[PDB]
Structure formats: structure tokens, C-alpha cells
Design a protein around this ligand. Structure first.
Ligand SMILES: [K+]
Ligand SMILES: [Mg+2]
Ligand SMILES: [Mg+2]
Ligand SMILES: [Mg+2]
Ligand SMILES: [Mg+2]
Ligand SMILES: [Mg+2]
Ligand SMILES: [Mg+2]
Ligand SMILES: [Mg+2]
Ligand SMILES: [Mg+2]
Ligand SMILES: [Mg+2]
Ligand SMILES: [Mg+2]
Ligand SMILES: [Mg+2]
Ligand SMILES: [Mg+2]
Ligand SMILES: [Mg+2]
Ligand SMILES: [Mg+2]
Ligand SMILES: [Mg+2]
Ligand SMILES: [Mg+2]
Ligand SMILES: [Mg+2]
Ligand SMILES: [Mg+2]
Ligand SMILES: [Mg+2]
Ligand SMILES: [Mg+2]
Ligand SMILES: [Mg+2]
Ligand SMILES: [Mg+2]
Ligand SMILES: [Mg+2]
Ligand SMILES: [Mg+2]
Ligand SMILES: [Zn+2]
Lengths: 98, 201, 46, 183, 307, 63
RNA sequence: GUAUGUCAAAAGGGAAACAGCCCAGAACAAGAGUUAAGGUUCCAAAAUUAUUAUUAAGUGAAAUAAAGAAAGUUUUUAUA
RNA sequence: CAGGCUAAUUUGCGCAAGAGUGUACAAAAUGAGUGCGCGGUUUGGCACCUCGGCUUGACUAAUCCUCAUGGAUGCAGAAACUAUGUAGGGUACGACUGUUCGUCGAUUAAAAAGUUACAUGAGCUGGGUUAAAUACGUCGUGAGACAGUAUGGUU
RNA sequence: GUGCUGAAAGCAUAUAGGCACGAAAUUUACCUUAAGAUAUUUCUUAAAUAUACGUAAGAAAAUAUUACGUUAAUAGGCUUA
């Protein structure tokens, strides 16, 4: 193509820091909701599903925090900043093996 | 370095003088590394070198020995110069005591060498000039550097002598550069037993 | 001399060295052999 | 508005600062330990400090429209400190719009024709705003190859002690102590 | 940058503060470096100013016929000397001819007044190698300054041609003459490439313009005849300019200097023909101060009527 | 810049570091000798009369 | 074709310059106000801010050229 | 038509591996079918967008000559082969063809290529292509047509 | 491309360190143009100097450039060769 979308293949240490904090912030929203309901003895299927198949920022590997799965790439990995609205959508899990 | 650890046996007559660390101011460099001036004197002559300061020399007089050591073996630069500085000293000691020699063999029909004087091209008074007839339209004349003695026991053999090995072997290579040995007949100038494998025909 | 991107030893007398490296250029990897001068190789172009 | 009503004579005056390219600089050097390893300021790190003085951005009254910059006398530019192999592998280019007339030269070859002063002028020049004050500000940079320069009497002083001299900080403190004996 | 790599302002003078005696490297640029890289090519002696008088042939006593150009020396004098201490290079300033005082300006009238030399017509500097090439001020240079067989370089101004087209000025071939060509028989044709080459005419493009009236040097010309009575120096070959124009003759730069015995023999003739060059110069310098002081005070009229 | 608000931010110069170390839990008086020329109304102690009680050790000594 | 969004009909900040990407939806001003994306040696507002390692090639530093070669270097795991 | 995107293809190249040829012996030379790439010269795809010669250059380097140089059971010398540096200068004349291209004659150290709107028509040329005229062949019931041919045709 | 010394790595190595050879390319040199610091025991107190005008030209589209103007051979005429 001749139209230039200058998007670097890797992120800067500043974009990574904000990513860690956005993943950390989401964990606090879920924990705040889960703790508020536990005090009343209630549960929500969405929360129970999140805490079951989604890790916390402290439990994620750097590769899972800054990259995503892409079957079209050489090594099946791709910069997470290449996902649409990547700063406002949740993305923490990739297929096993990649 | 297994060579640097090896002590250096100072034969009789040879005297090693180690100076104190000094730095000469250079206007183009912000920091010059200190160096030590080592003078090896004896019968044939005297030689001097400037070694880095991280190389420590324990000169034993009554025992006539001198071992080298470095301040940090894990540094690449210190390891390298440990063996290099040891090798240079071993040559300085054996050169001021016995002297280094190089033999050049001239192979070919019409290859001759003669030692004479050329007062018109002499760089210093009494400079000897090795004249070589090597099949060229013109004569090849080379002046021996100050500090060496050249001779010709036979017309097809040259003998160089001096206290500095780097100066002797460098001059031998300057003469050999006129006729490098060829593989088809063996014609050329051979230095210190240098040989060349011949060809089929 | 043979210039290749994949230089390899061809006998027990071949040696890998990096020559012509100085304060201006990085140099080249060489295969030098005192036995056979047909083993001489260089990796990289000027 | 009270903070600006007064005598602005000395705020807009041209101060003559001095720096040596060979003296170690604990602030501008990257190595900070041990004390014997502290280097002088590298070419670009020194140039970035100078461009700030030439612009006047160290002054609390700074404004980009006003030319409130100072002078900077640099000495010992022959020992300009550089890292890696910049001295022999960095190239400076030049063209005059004529195809084929591209002029190239290395740093070591430029220091042989015009000395280390020109290497520092080019580095400071590119760090200044690209406007009509760039040539004036760059002209106030006084770069010399050795210790001799015609401004040994212009350098700022405090009690007769030039800034950067051995005991210039004691001369300054002695003057302020005697300045508090008033209402 | 205006010129070259140097961004230094044009009013700054830092040269005397960057000295080699202080341990600094010798620069590759500057007067000292410029002279050093021209020591082998700079002549040892000075030259002479001569007037091109015409061309002819030199007939040899055995059959030789050599074309040649005749250059006459008309009262060639040494007017001034240049030194490194004062100018940054060695050179001798030589004069030619005479000129009416009224046509000479007051600045030049006082320039010759301090030297004891009559006002000249043309001045020119000849660069020498070292301080041995400087000559006494006020000595006349004759054709014997050169010897037969001496190779010299001749510098002059070429014949002017005015505005010249592309054929005469650059050797352009032109275009066809009959096979349909329309109004473009002597024209330059295309002046460059299209958008892909800059959409502009490139600098240095060869175009019509003025031609000639520029300095031109012919190197390695032998001297065939030397006659002092006629004051001519016959050199082989052709020389730039018209008859009656002044040219500069000097030893060739691409050839070895003349023998040392000859360079000294010529300097020895100047001392014999002008043994009072220094006594007459200092006397003229002394008078200049007296007249210069009178002009300052306004009493010059007195010093004129006394004699 | 495009607006006066943006021009004010690009020309911003921070306050003096003395005013940045603000206090907490209460008020505070600090010694802040400015880098400026003093007015002629700051009479030196040598020009004060012997009766004037304001004569007193330097503020540095009062701290 | 399908799903989602933007542009189209959306200015503003970031991406050197930029219809479609990352933020964010311009009623008008004031403020060292609080922030987003994005950044903080100089051009140019903000760190020459701290910690641990690697690289010596200006590699790289806001658009990853491949297979491959190799006494470049570091680490780990076996081993003499 | 040109420019842009693309690179299947190319009369454009490189690297890797090495069946095999080289009396012997893989790598002097040679290199099946292949793999990994570069490049933007050819023929094409898309549809963002509706010739040749002469004169005069500039630039690239993947080099025909000239300069330095490694390898060469297959470098005795000479000449040539291959390869590494290197683009300063040169690369001409004629016959045929509208020709770039190509074929040929005869010299030469050599008679190499490419990009630039397949450089250059507000600088020239108009032979080719080329509207009106006309004929031939073929096609069409015909008016006419043709990637045909021929003579002529406001630059 | 070709070396000397020589270790890291007891050897080897033109690898680090210390020295060197080496091309129609480069740089210098050479030539022209531009640049205009500087020089002269230079000139100038209302000038030095320059221009205009006239005779021209080593110059020439204009312009510019280089000479001369009676204490003068600048152009023309005349005379001689
Ligand atoms: K004067
Ligand atoms: Mg584009
Ligand atoms: Mg004329
Ligand atoms: Mg013609
Ligand atoms: Mg006509
Ligand atoms: Mg343009
Ligand atoms: Mg234009
Ligand atoms: Mg619409
Ligand atoms: Mg917008
Ligand atoms: Mg940026
Ligand atoms: Mg703030
Ligand atoms: Mg700032
Ligand atoms: Mg880079
Ligand atoms: Mg379209
Ligand atoms: Mg060979
Ligand atoms: Mg050349
Ligand atoms: Mg075209
Ligand atoms: Mg056109
Ligand atoms: Mg007709
Ligand atoms: Mg080599
Ligand atoms: Mg060894
Ligand atoms: Mg060796
Ligand atoms: Mg010249
Ligand atoms: Mg006219
Ligand atoms: Mg007359
Ligand atoms: Zn081998």
C-alpha cells in the first residue's frame, strides 16, 4: 500500500506502564464488586466467570500483557497495541501453546 | 595467561630498571592512563618500553627474577596485555643479552646481495646499504635501520643482527617483499628456514 | 578468495579470524588456511 | 504585577559563562561512580547544556521572543569527549542543490580542518530554535581549542574569583552574609 | 554555512589563541598549512611583468624553425615585499612602466613617495617560496633575469569575445541544417530533464554568455632568446591576450627550480647594478615623514618653494 | 499558539523552589533571601539610630 | 459478503507531515486547575527520576527485510 | 500513454544447499530439479488518476576497455577464465531496417548497460503509428470493416 | 589484497595491543572563478575619491571594465618605412 499507518511493531516503556496500570485498575473494579457482594452473601455469574478464567496483572506474563495471538504472523504473536480500542477493551488470555 | 605467570630469568649482566607511574599531558585526550617505563640494559645495548600501570612487576634482585601480574584477571584488556607484555620482555632480555638474528636465502639464477655504503642516500653517517640484484632493470638498495648490522657470508645469503626483534624481522620482511617465493621453481627470498611446497611440473 | 555468506572450514588447518576491523569499519570474517590456499574465504562485502 | 515592577537591567544583561570540555562533570556525565571514572560532558550532553544558556532558559524572566541569552566560553575543545567510535565513523554532510555536489567528512577529519570548536558549534546549532535568533545565539558561543582565549577578563566573577575557580563558592557566601545586615 | 564547514562568524579573530606551542594539533587548514602543501611547487625567485609585442619564429643555425612570442620588459622594478609576519605569505610586488602623476591618485602618490620609485603603470605580486626570494626595493629587473632554455609560465588575460553562443563558448555541435529543421540551427537544444530530474535547470548548466577576458596560464614554455638592449624575452609557443597587453612571466611550477648557481648569480647582479638600493630607500622613507608631517600641519607649500 | 491559553502554558516558568516545599499540619515561616538587588529603604544597621529598636541580629542568626 | 467502529457529516490532543488508526465529541472566556491517549536531554510543555540486567553494532532510538554462516558477548543447564 | 499500488512473469540479480560434470578430485571451472530473498528493467493484474532520431544533460553501478588484486591436479610465460576493489575517462565509423531492438562489413585498449514522464517536441525532426482521399487482399447481402498492405496528408 | 611484532587461548594467528605495504576512485597539487581578512613607515577636515562630459580602448546588448583629456600621442589627419 501507499497510505502510511506508522504503527511500530513494539511498544515503548511508557505504553507498557499504562497497560500494567489499566490491567491493575480493572482488577480493582472486579474485586470491589466481588467484595461488596460477598458481604451480602450474593454472587453474579459474570463475576464468577471472570475470576475463573481471567488472571490478574500480577499473575500475567509480560508476553500476555504486551502481545496477542495472530494466526497470520510468523510466530503467531502480535503487538497488543494493534488491537482496536486496546486501551478500553479487556485482553488477557491467548490460545494455549502460543 | 600461562605465559605471564612464568617468571623471567634475568641472565648475568642484564639489568632491568622499573620507573614510577607517569602521565604525559595530551591536549586531545581528557584522561591519559598512567604507564611505567621499563629499561632493559646489558652488553649488546639497551631497550625501553612503556607498559600499562595495571601490570605489576615484582622484580627480585638477589634472585634475578621478575614476574608479572595484573590487577584484574576478569578484564579482557588486562588478560591480553599480560601475555603480550611478558612476551615483549622475554625478547628484550634475550635480545640485549644474546641478540636476535635473521637469515635470508636468495634462490634463483642471478640473485646476489652485497653490503656497501651509499654516502649520497645515507640517513645517518656510515649507514650500510644492502644491494640486491633480483632480475630487475634497476638495482635494489635498502639502508639498514640505525641499530642493526647486516652481512653477507655468501653472495646468496644475508645475515641481519640487532637487539630489537621487531626491528630485525620487519627489515627482513622489507627485503623479502621484492621477491616473494614462487611455487613453480622456488625462486625468491626465504627468511629463517622458510620453505615453499613446489608444484607438479 | 571466495566471498560467501556461509563460510565454513574445509580441513583441520582452516581458521576463522576477523580482520580489517579498525576504528572505521567492523571488518569481515575470514577463513584462512596455510595448507590449501583454495580454502580462503571472506564473509561480507566492502 | 508587583513582581515585575523594578529594575530589569541586570536580568537582561549578558553574563559570560565558562566551561572546559576536559574537566569532569558529575552532573552531565553518565558515569557517577567511582569518583575516578567521572568523565567530562559528552559532545551532545554539553551542547544541550549550552543551548539552554544561549537561549536564556535558565533565567526566571525567560521569553522566547526576547533575546535574553548569555555568552558561553568553551575551552579545551581539542579534548572533546566522545563515546564509541563517533570520532572516526560519524559523518557530516553538505549539499549546494547541484546534483553530484554532496560533500562528506568525518568528525576526525573535521576536527583537523576547523578543530573541535566546529564540531561543538554544529551540535549546539541544531539544538537551537530554527528562527531569526539562531545566528545571534550561536554567535555568543565562544569555543577555543586550548586554555587561551580573549575573554579571561569577561568571565563572571564574585569577589575576584571566577566561577569554576577553586574558591569561588566561598567568595560568594562571604558576600551574602554581609548583605543581611540591613532591614 | 556560508562557505565550507565553518560556522564561525566573520568578525571573530581566534587564530592567535589556538597555538601549536600549547600542545594542540597543527590544523590542516590555514596559511601555514596552505604554504606547506605548496612548498614543492612555489618558485624560489620572483617573476617579471612583460608586454606582449607579437609572434614570430626563431630560426636555428642548422635548420630549426620554432614559433615563439616576444615579450618586452619596460622598466620592471621591485616595489614591495610580502612576509609571513606582515602578510601571511612570501611575495614580491613588481611594477611595470610609468604613469603621469596627475592620473595617479593621492593614495598611490604617497605610496611611491615612501619608496623613492616613480609612479608605475601596473603592479603585480609574485609568490616566492621563502625569505630568500625577497629582493631589494627599487631595483630594475632585466631580461637577463632568465637564461636561454629556462622554462617559464606565462599568465595573461585572454582576448575578449563578448556574448558567445553555445557553439563557440562550449563546443556544442548544433543541429541539422536542411532536413526540416525550423529556426534551431545554432541553438542549445534541451536544457534538462523533466519532473523526475528536479523540474528545474540544474546549476552549472552550460549556456550562452560572456566569453574571454579572463586570466589564462600557459605552462612549461622555454625561453629561446634573451636580449637586454631590446628588453625582450622570446618564449616558445603562444600567449594569452592581444599585443600590447601585460603578462606575468615566472619560473614554471611543474619543473625543478633553476640551478642554485644561477639563482645566486642573478641576485649578485642586482647588488652590482644597484649597490645603493638600501641607502636610497631609507632616504626616500625619511623624506616621506617630513612631507607627511608638513601635510598634517599644513605647511607643505613652504617645503615646495624652498627648492 | 492558536489560543492565548496555550501560549500561556508554553511560556510558563515555575515558581521558586522555596515556595514549593509547602508546610503541613500548620503554618510556617521560612527564610527566603531572594537573588535580587535590595531597595534603598532596607536601611543597613550602621545607618540606624541608637534608639531604633528594630536593630537586631541578621535573620540568618535569628533562625 | 459477514461482525465492530471511525470518516463521510467531527473540530481538538497523539501518530514528524495524515478523511478512515490510538484518545476524545468544539456554546464563549479565565486557571502554573484535574485527566485521556501520548510523552518528559535540546528543538518543545514535562525526569538528564529511581532498580536490575543485556548490547559496542549509532545495532537501535515511532514503518522489525529472510534462510543461513561464525573461537563476538552474556546467561542457564550438563560435563572434564 | 505517463505516474501510483502489486511483483505472477521477465531478455534483472543475489544467497543457501550440492545430484552431477571436471581422466583422479564437490566447491579452478561447472551447478539438475529446488529453497530463502533483493530489485523495479519486460510482459501482465488493479483502476487512485484520463516510437525512433537530433541537441543537451544529470544520476546509478549489477563493469566492455584502462588501474590495484586473491583463486586456478585444471596459475610455466603470454593470452584468457573466475572473483574482490573501483564509475576518473572513454565506449567510435559505416551498410540494412521508420525502427529502440536485431543482422552484417571494417577498425579499435574497448566498441558494456540502466534510471531520469521507457529524461528532453511552450529545444528541433515527423520516417513509424497516424482523421478526411484512393487501391489491393480478406470479411460482410450491403452501407462498410481489418491487430492487413500501399501512395499522400497545416506540428 | 599483502605483511612484521604478538597475546587473550603455553600452540596458532597480519584477529586484541603496537607498526607497515598498497589503485585510472578520494584528497592534495595544478588551472579558473569567487571570496575580500590583511598589507602600505598610502590618502582624506570637507575632502581623499568617484562620477559626469569629451577622445577612445587590451573591454563591449544596456550596464560594467581599462586608459587618456594640451604640463596630452586617446582617436582622426599628415609624413616616412
Ligand atoms: K596613512
Ligand atoms: Mg504514500
Ligand atoms: Mg577586442
Ligand atoms: Mg553543423
Ligand atoms: Mg530557415
Ligand atoms: Mg522540488
Ligand atoms: Mg521550478
Ligand atoms: Mg457526499
Ligand atoms: Mg479529527
Ligand atoms: Mg516525537
Ligand atoms: Mg501543573
Ligand atoms: Mg523544557
Ligand atoms: Mg540508526
Ligand atoms: Mg477512477
Ligand atoms: Mg595467485
Ligand atoms: Mg583523480
Ligand atoms: Mg519518453
Ligand atoms: Mg516539453
Ligand atoms: Mg506529394
Ligand atoms: Mg585480506
Ligand atoms: Mg605467538
Ligand atoms: Mg605470526
Ligand atoms: Mg591557480
Ligand atoms: Mg557599447
Ligand atoms: Mg596617429
Ligand atoms: Zn584448509
Amino acid at each position: 500500500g501507499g497510505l502510511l499507518w506508522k504503527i511500530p511493531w513494539r511498544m515503548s516503556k511508557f505504553q507498557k506502564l499504562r497497560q500494567r496500570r489499566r490491567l491493575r485498575a480493572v482488577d480493582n473494579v472486579v474485586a470491589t464488586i466481588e467484595n461488596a457482594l460477598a458481604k451480602k452473601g450474593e454472587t453474579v455469574k459474570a463475576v464468577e466467570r471472570w475470576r475463573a478464567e481471567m488472571p490478574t496483572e500480577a499473575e500475567m506474563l509480560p508476553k500476555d500483557k504486551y502481545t496477542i495471538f495472530d494466526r497470520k504472523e510468523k510466530r503467531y504473536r502480535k503487538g497488543i497495541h494493534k488491537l482496536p480500542k486496546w486501551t478500553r477493551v479487556s485482553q488477557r488470555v491467548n490460545p494455549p501453546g502460543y | 595467561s600461562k605465559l605471564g605467570r612464568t617468571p623471567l630469568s634475568i641472565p648475568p649482566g642484564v639489568e632491568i630498571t622499573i620507573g614510577e607511574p607517569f602521565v604525559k599531558r595530551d591536549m586531545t585526550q581528557w584522561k591519559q592512563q598512567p604507564k611505567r617505563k621499563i629499561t632493559v640494559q646489558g652488553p649488546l645495548g639497551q631497550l625501553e618500553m612503556d607498559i600499562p600501570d595495571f601490570i605489576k612487576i615484582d622484580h627480585d634482585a638477589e634472585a634475578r627474577r621478575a614476574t608479572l601480574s595484573v590487577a584484574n584477571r576478569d578484564e579482557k584488556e588486562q588478560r591480553e596485555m599480560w601475555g603480550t607484555t611478558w612476551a615483549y620482555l622475554n625478547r628484550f632480555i634475550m635480545g640485549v643479552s644474546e641478540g636476535h638474528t635473521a637469515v635470508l636465502r636468495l634462490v634463483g639464477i642471478g640473485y646476489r646481495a652485497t653490503i656497501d655504503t651509499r654516502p649520497e642516500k645515507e640517513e645517518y653517517p656510515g649507514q650500510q646499504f644492502v644491494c640486491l640484484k633480483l632480475g630487475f632493470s634497476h638495482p635494489v638498495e635498502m639502508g639498514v635501520p640505525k641499530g642493526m648490522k647486516a652481512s653477507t657470508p655468501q653472495p646468496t645469503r644475508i645475515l641481519l643482527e640487532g637487539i630489537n626483534r621487531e626491528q630485525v624481522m620487519t627489515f627482513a620482511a622489507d627485503i623479502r617483499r621484492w621477491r616473494v617465493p614462487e611455487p613453480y621453481k622456488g625462486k625468491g627470498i626465504f627468511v629463517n628456514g622458510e620453505t615453499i611446497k613446489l608444484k607438479q611440473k | 578468495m571466495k566471498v560467501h555468506s556461509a563460510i565454513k572450514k574445509r580441513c583441520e588447518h582452516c581458521k576463522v579470524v576477523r580482520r580489517k576491523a579498525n576504528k572505521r569499519q567492523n571488518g569481515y570474517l575470514y577463513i584462512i588456511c596455510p595448507a590449501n590456499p583454495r580454502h580462503k574465504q571472506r564473509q561480507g562485502y566492502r | 504585577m508587583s513582581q515585575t515592577v523594578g529594575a530589569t537591567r541586570l536580568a537582561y544583561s549578558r553574563v559570560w559563562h565558562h566551561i572546559s570540555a576536559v574537566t569532569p562533570h558529575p552532573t552531565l556525565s553518565t558515569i557517577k561512580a567511582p569518583s575516578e571514572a567521572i568523565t567530562p560532558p559528552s559532545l551532545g550532553r554539553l551542547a544541550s547544556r549550552i543551548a539552554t544558556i544561549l537561549m536564556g532558559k535558565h533565567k526566571p524572566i525567560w521569553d522566547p521572543s526576547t533575546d535574553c541569552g548569555d555568552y558561553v566560553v568553551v575551552t579545551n575543545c581539542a579534548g572533546l569527549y566522545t563515546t564509541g567510535h563517533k570520532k572516526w565513523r560519524k559523518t557530516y554532510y553538505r549539499h549546494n542543490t547541484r546534483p553530484g555536489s554532496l560533500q562528506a567528512i568525518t568528525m576526525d577529519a573535521l576536527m583537523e580542518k576547523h578543530g573541535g570548536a566546529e564540531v561543538l558549534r554544529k551540535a549546539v546549532s541544531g539544538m537551537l530554535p530554527k528562527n531569526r535568533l539562531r545566528d545571534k545565539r550561536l554567535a555568543r558561543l565562544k569555543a577555543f581549542e586550548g586554555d587561551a582565549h580573549p575573554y579571561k577578563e569577561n568571565l563572571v566573577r564574585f569577589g575576584g574569583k571566577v566561577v569554576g575557580a577553586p574558591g569561588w563558592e566561598e567568595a560568594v557566601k562571604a558576600i551574602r552574609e554581609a548583605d543581611m545586615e540591613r532591614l | 554555512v556560508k562557505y565550507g564547514w565553518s560556522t564561525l562568524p566573520k568578525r571573530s579573530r581566534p587564530t592567535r589563541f589556538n597555538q601549536v606551542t600549547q600542545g594542540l594539533p597543527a590544523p590542516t587548514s590555514g596559511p601555514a598549512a596552505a604554504l606547506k602543501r605548496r612548498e614543492k611547487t612555489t618558485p624560489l625567485r620572483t617573476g617579471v611583468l612583460a608586454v606582449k609585442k607579437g609572434m614570430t619564429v626563431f630560426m636555428g643555425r642548422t635548420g630549426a624553425r620554432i614559433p615563439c612570442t616576444v615579450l618586452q620588459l619596460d622598466r620592471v622594478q621591485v616595489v614591495a615585499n610580502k612576509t609571513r609576519a606582515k602578510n601571511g605569505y612570501w611575495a614580491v610586488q613588481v611594477g611595470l612602466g610609468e604613469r603621469r602623476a596627475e592620473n595617479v591618485g593621492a593614495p598611490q602618490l604617497g605610496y611611491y613617495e615612501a619608496k623613492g620609485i616613480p609612479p608605475k603603470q601596473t603592479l603585480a605580486e609574485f609568490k616566492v617560496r621563502n625569505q630568500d626570494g625577497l629582493l631589494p626595493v627599487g631595483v630594475q629587473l632585466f631580461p637577463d633575469w632568465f637564461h636561454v632554455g629556462q622554462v617559464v609560465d606565462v599568465r595573461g588575460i585572454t582576448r575578449g569575445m563578448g556574448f558567445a553562443g553555445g557553439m563557440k563558448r562550449h563546443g556544442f555541435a548544433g543541429q541539422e541544417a536542411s532536413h526540416g529543421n525550423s529556426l534551431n540551427h545554432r541553438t542549445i537544444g534541451s536544457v534538462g530533464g523533466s519532473q523526475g530530474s528536479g523540474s528545474r535547470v540544474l546549476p552549472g548548466k552550460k549556456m550562452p554568455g560572456r566569453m574571454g577576458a579572463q586570466q589564462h596560464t600557459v605552462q612549461n614554455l622555454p625561453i629561446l632568446m634573451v636580449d637586454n638592449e631590446l628588453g625582450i624575452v622570446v618564449v616558445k609557443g603562444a600567449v594569452a591576450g592581444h599585443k600590447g597587453a601585460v603578462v606575468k612571466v615566472q619560473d614554471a611550477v611543474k619543473k625543478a627550480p633553476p640551478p642554485e648557481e644561477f639563482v645566486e648569480a642573478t641576485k649578485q647582479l642586482l647588488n652590482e647594478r644597484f649597490p645603493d638600493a638600501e641607502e636610497k630607500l631609507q632616504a626616500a622613507r625619511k623624506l616621506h615623514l617630513e612631507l607627511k608631517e608638513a601635510r598634517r600641519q599644513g605647511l607643505i607649500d613652504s617645503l615646495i618653494k624652498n627648492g | 499558539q492558536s489560543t492565548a491559553n496555550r501560549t500561556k502554558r508554553m511560556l510558563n516558568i515555575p515558581p521558586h523552589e522555596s515556595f514549593l516545599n509547602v508546610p503541613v499540619e500548620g503554618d510556617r515561616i521560612i527564610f527566603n533571601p531572594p537573588s535580587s538587588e535590595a531597595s534603598v529603604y532596607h536601611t543597613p544597621f550602621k545607618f540606624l539610630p541608637r534608639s531604633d529598636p528594630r536593630r537586631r541580629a541578621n535573620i540568618y542568626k535569628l533562625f
